[PDB]
Amino acid sequence: DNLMERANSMFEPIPKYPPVIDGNELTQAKVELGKMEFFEPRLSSSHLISCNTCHNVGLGGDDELPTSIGHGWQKGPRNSPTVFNAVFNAAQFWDGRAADLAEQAKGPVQAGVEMSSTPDRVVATLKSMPEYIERFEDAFPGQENPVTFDNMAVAIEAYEATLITPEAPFDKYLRGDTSALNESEKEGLALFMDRGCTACHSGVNLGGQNYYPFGLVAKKGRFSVTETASDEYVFRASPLRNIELTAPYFHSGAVWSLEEAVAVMGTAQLGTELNNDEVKSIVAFLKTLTGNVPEVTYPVLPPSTANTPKPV
């Protein structure tokens, strides 16, 4: 009743359709082409990696092992965020200097198309296959040279926008089904809002909207969340939606236990102190954020040809 009213003033349920990003209107042809690309391993120089490799849509939309590659990354290994509902995050996954945000940061959907392979190799690869040319023509009617790096990016972004998970028990609760959550989960919800977690984890994805100078450190357990030295480094407050499916946790992916993840975020400095029973209650609540994984028909990709660059 009032709890439901409070929850609704702090959060929102996943809608049936995704918000249009940068005026990219979704169409069947764009989404279909974007899906082919999402699963296309030949965009990588080795031909062994595709988006699905690190954002497995059948296993939480992310990667189980920290990686040092992808998106032209040139530093140490980092955990991969889930592509599920990423379209609703204004901030993107960040594991670096606050000073670099201004010029290097962008929306999740857009960060998603930052590639390690060069535009030339990618375009040449796609143009080497008749079927891809036809798909680009279907997706971009009216364009004489439809196969471009920018159009590839637009198609992938259209597909990314469709990777949303509606109908989680919590969303049903927000929409009025008071029985969608049991008493144990409702206590967790009340505590999530009463212990101040909402200062950083709120809105449609319960996080993902701002950066903070607080990150996981290897000092319950052998971990803790502490402020970075001189606030030099910042992290995006994690969107907690579907957290049940997205282990391991934090920028480093060092935590596998959801209970531990909740515990290290309860601190005096953040004004989020929790006792063991409350940690368990919040865990119960967070498990109600799992939505319906979108159905995916595995795309049948076209065969390579003499002009298709060879695996390197």
Residues that constitute the known binding site for heme c: 51, 54-55, 71, 78, 89, 93-94, 197, 200-201, 216, 236, 250-251, 265
* Residue 44 in tokens: 């990588």
Long-range contacts of 106-112 (CB under 8 A, 24+ apart): 107/21, 107/22, 108/81, 108/160, 108/208, 109/21, 109/157, 109/160, 109/161, 110/21, 110/22, 110/157, 111/71, 112/51, 112/71, 112/83, 112/86, 112/156, 112/157, 112/160
Instruction: Kindly indicate which of the ranges 11-19, 96-104, 142-150, 189-197 contains the residues binding ligand HEC, using the contact rule CB under 6 A.
Output: 189-197
Q: If binding is defined by CB under 6 A, does position 155 make contact with ligand HEC?
A: no
Give the number of other CB atoms < 10 A from CB of residue 295: 6
Q: If binding is defined by CB under 6 A, does position 309 make contact with ligand HEC?
A: no
Catalytic pick from 5, 37, 64, 114?
114
* Residue 108 in tokens: 């999740």
Q: Please state the closest distance from residue 3 (CB atom) to ligand HEC, in A.
A: 17
Residues 238-297 that bind ligand HEC (CB under 6 A): 238, 240, 243, 246, 249-251, 261-262, 265-266, 270, 272, 274, 282
For the chain, helix (H) and strand (E) counts, in that order, are: 12, 5
- Interface characters, 40-79, with ligand HEC (x: CB under 6 A): ---------x-x-xxx-----------x-xxx-x----x-
Q: If binding is defined by CB under 6 A, does position 154 make contact with ligand HEC?
A: no
First to last CA, the chain: 60
Strand partners, 203: 11
Residue with the two structure tokens 């998603």: 112
To the query of whether residue 114 is one of the catalytic residues in this protein, the response is: yes
* Position among 156, 174, 204, 284 found at the interface with ligand HEC (CB under 6 A): 156
* Position among 21, 36, 92, 223 found at the interface with ligand HEC (CB under 6 A): 92
Q: If binding is defined by CB under 6 A, does position 152 make contact with ligand HEC?
A: no
* Residue 171 in tokens: 């969303």
Angle at 197 between CA 196 and CA 203, to 5 degrees: 115
Q: If binding is defined by CB under 6 A, does position 160 make contact with ligand HEC?
A: yes
CA neighbor of 287 nearest in space, from 237, 246, 250: 246
Residues 21-40 that bind ligand HEC (CB under 6 A): 38
Q: Please state the closest distance from residue 141 (CB atom) to ligand HEC, in A.
A: 23
CA neighbor of 157 nearest in space, from 293, 23, 13: 23
Give residue 186's identity as a one-letter amino acid code: K
Nearer to ligand HEC among residue 32 and residue 160 (C-beta): 160
Dihedral of CA 73/216/101/202: which sign?
A: positive
Which residues does the annotation mark as catalytic? Answer: 114
Give contact residues for ligand HEC (rule: CB under 6 A): 38, 49, 51, 53-55, 67, 69-71, 73, 78, 80-81, 83, 86, 89, 92-93, 108-109, 111-113, 156, 160, 195-197, 199-201, 212, 214-216, 235, 237-238, 240, 243, 246, 249-251, 261-262, 265-266, 270, 272, 274, 282
